[PDB]
Ligand binder design. Structure first.
Ligand code: HEM
Ligand code: HEM
Ligand code: HEM
Ligand SMILES: [Fe+2]
Ligand SMILES: [Fe+2]
Ligand SMILES: [Fe+2]
Ligand SMILES: [Fe+2]
Ligand SMILES: [Fe+2]
Ligand SMILES: [Fe+2]
Ligand SMILES: [Fe+2]
Ligand SMILES: [Fe+3]
Ligand SMILES: [Fe+3]
Ligand SMILES: [Fe+3]
Ligand SMILES: [Fe+3]
Ligand SMILES: [Fe+3]
Ligand SMILES: [Fe+3]
Ligand SMILES: [Fe+3]
Lengths: 157, 157, 157, 157, 157, 158, 157
């Protein structure tokens, strides 16, 4: 079994996006922990681990179709200074991923490849959940404020 | 055993009120949880299940008297945007229920039907407790403020 | 993320149907229990709880797309008096739901919204299972009879 | 609920294929165990049991649509002498099944029947996994050789 | 307290090397597992996890000195086809790391920074042990033969 | 075995610094606990115990080289009234210690004494960690505000 | 919710009576224990604790109606010398309480306040039980005698 070139192209582009997300989420988690915002750091670390799981699934699927995964290419990694900036950078990454996933699902399903489409469907569900969380947190920061919001995630130990 | 039409009318009106309360409380709990106010959402959910218990008891009593419960009629369901508005809507519902319960208890007890009166007495006690809680929370919001009050009911997960 | 008006319209119509089903099933369970048919009552109660879970899932999906769930609507609620009539009313409700679900799945999937389509697919599977059970029970009643069928669900304890 | 004749035709053809696979896999497992290749025999038995699970699911789906499962006809059952021949026969069976499954999924989904399509999708995923395993084993036999490969799957007991 | 630019430059170069090693080792583990060589795959996976332990330690040290870790650039990632090529690629990576670590330890210790020197000393010990293992495995492949060597790392289930 | 006079001089100076740190940290912990800031008090108590362990290790090393530990000296002990002032005093103490430790490590290692150098290396790592924590807390106080910062370390208990 | 002034007046008078009873019962228990009548002392202590619980319930009810509990006023506290005098003093207190409770229940129930009436009903039941016990003990003392009755409650451990 060999897949079409286009399906493998879509899978490789998604894999590159997943690797970039892993790097960005880890850097942000370390930066947050360094400043004393422990409760945010735990969540960001967990999200990075989720990105690793997605990347492994994509690699498995690519290999099963007699392809060569791309572990050399990266996109642009965004680094933030405030907390609002970190949230906005994550939002940008997630939106790009969602659009790509929808287009890929359509194209793959149009060529009689169902397992790849199901892989993207699961990834799409997870991405939508994460983007929902990010938007909620941005709304909370807007309502409360930087200092009053930050006083609830700092811990003494 | 066949009760008077008026006692069944009172019981059916109370049942309609309880169903409307179930709807409103569950919707409010979902809306609060969506925004990140977790500790409020737990309490609102518990209140909705109390509405469970009240409605089921009323249905049992109506059926025992050879009547037909009304599961088709609803009152007006109020939806709030802030937190103060949600509290005020709940307050309105509770006050209406309390007045109806008192009038019904008098009328029923005047016709030699004691079990129905006891049912309303228990429901009345519970409603008074809930209205007390709501008024206390409104006072707290007034004293502290919206932002400072809201910072105490938000978690990360 | 904001969905199309039509997807939200489909979701709201399904939510109204779910609420109507909850009411009808719970009333039927209470009516059956009052008459001494115990095992039927247990089964009907479980089915009503299933409908409750479906409604909660629909509400979550509607809220995630920046919509307003409709908790004020209600279709016509059918009430039966013998076992055959109860089974037939449930059958009518289920058939309507299945047709609506199929049409909605097509329309949603044609607009690049996959998660909503998956929600309806799961709901459709459950509806088909329930309709199968109802048809089997109607066949059994026809073969055995009302009295000989009812003697097997009556318990005394 | 009655399905279209074509969907039932597809399901019955898949059921016949599943029964033929059960027979072939179990015969191969017995033949391998007779010769002293124990670790191969365990795997082959497990695969035959999986084919049974698939057949039972297909029968359930066919019955739910008011159809008559076909438990009478069989395809051609292939028997091998070496180990390479057994692997090649299994490969042929799997490839035929995969092509049929893809065509059927398209046709079914084009007629507004989703549950049948999901059944075929799950079966397709499992078939692809098994074909992957078979191709890997054939590559290993080619690289090492038949004697050196066979020395690793024999025990005394 | 902020360190010299040169110490941070050394730390950042080592961090880039560690990230490249993580990528290469994980890809090699997946490739080996796909072919049926199981114990090799387990060992390679463990090595990749070790490489990330090193990367996290380096990031912590860089952040403590008021620096900016570099999570953007990568070196050249080598991909092999047979076991010998994979082992040789790993050997090349390890040798480069060893040379860099020795030079960095000298330079850092000459400027009165001891904790950074200790970090590199630990990393250097680990790298030397890994390179020892790789050379031993290459010797074994040369002696036994590549088919007779591969027959000992292939398993069935 | 008899060490050089200079190595013992370095060790004795470090021991005096450790004793001064013990005193200052314990006093600060008591002052913080008296005012109702509980979690700060727990952290400061733990830090004082760490300084005690460091002092014991230094005494052991000095005795092994046929020397006489100095348990009579004391530097100036700083006492603060706010929370910012307490953090700043601790910062001053830590910076002095770090500079002394680096100079001592160089000098000792230049005379073929390795165990003493390793002792100072461990102490230096711990000092750097503590100074990092102090700087982070000062940044947090600057950002949040001192009242909004203090509201998060008070408790009823009892 | 604000109650009528008269209901609050009744509740406050009952609260004053409860506080006076607490004081008298505890003093009597201490006096009895000092003389060596241990088995009487245990019972008197338990009764004082019961009065404490009643007072707490009354305070809660008064506060829920937006009133001010009266913790400053006391009635006349009676102190006895022999056991008969202690029993008679307790009897007097209980009789006064019972009469007041009956009058209050009537008045409150005539103004559509039901929860307060239920509170007094529970308190009235408890008072009647205690007065029954006291009368029985006085009858026993009359039949047996002071010395023969006292010899059965004195213990030495
Ligand atoms: C099931 C698959 C995987 C698992 C269970 C896993 C597990 C872990 C663990 C335990 C850590 C250490 C966490 C820490 O240091 O705080 C980690 C970090 C890391 N892993 Fe993954 N990993 C997986 C896949 C991958 C893949 C595929 C890559 C790269 C292609 C990768 C790259 C990294 C990196 C760069 C870090 C550290 C960066 C940071 O500090 O956030 N991992 N992972
Ligand atoms: C006569 C009508 C209804 C009755 C008798 C009823 C009854 C109940 C009962 C007994 C429970 C379990 C109690 C608990 O665990 O707290 C429950 C929970 C639940 N109810 Fe209802 N209900 C009714 C209407 C509704 C409506 C209108 C909704 C939503 C629109 C709904 C959605 C739910 C959900 C989702 C749960 C699970 C709680 C959760 O997941 O958080 N039910 N209901
Ligand atoms: C609950 C555990 C301990 C308590 C309550 C305790 C009690 C104390 C206190 C309160 C002080 C200093 C008080 C002050 O200076 O104002 C002290 C001095 C000291 N402690 Fe502890 N101690 C404990 C454990 C230890 C341990 C485990 C060690 C060593 C492993 C240790 C070694 C020392 C030393 C060396 C000094 C004096 C050093 C100097 O003054 O230069 N202590 N003891
Ligand atoms: Fe992802
Ligand atoms: Fe309530
Ligand atoms: Fe449903
Ligand atoms: Fe199969
Ligand atoms: Fe390594
Ligand atoms: Fe120290
Ligand atoms: Fe009392
Ligand atoms: Fe994501
Ligand atoms: Fe109620
Ligand atoms: Fe259902
Ligand atoms: Fe199979
Ligand atoms: Fe490394
Ligand atoms: Fe320290
Ligand atoms: Fe009493």
């Amino acid at each position: 079994m060999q897949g079409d070139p286009e399906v493998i192209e879509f899978l490789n582009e998604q894999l590159t996006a997943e690797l970039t997300a892993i790097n960005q989420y880890f850097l942000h988690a370390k930066l947050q922990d360094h400043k004393g915002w422990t409760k945010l750091a735990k969540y960001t670390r967990a999200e990075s681990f989720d990105e690793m799981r997605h990347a492994e699934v994509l690699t498995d699927r690519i290999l099963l179709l007699d392809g060569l995964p791309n572990y050399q290419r990266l996109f642009h990694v965004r680094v933030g200074q405030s907390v609002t900036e970190m949230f906005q950078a994550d939002r940008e990454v997630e939106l790009e991923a969602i659009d790509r996933l929808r287009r890929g699902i359509e194209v793959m399903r149009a060529k009689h490849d169902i397992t790849s489409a199901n892989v993207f469907e699961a990834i799409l569900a997870d991405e939508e959940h994460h983007i929902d969380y990010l938007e909620t947190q941005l709304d909370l920061i807007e309502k409360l404020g930087e200092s009053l919001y930050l006083s609830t995630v700092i811990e003494q130990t």
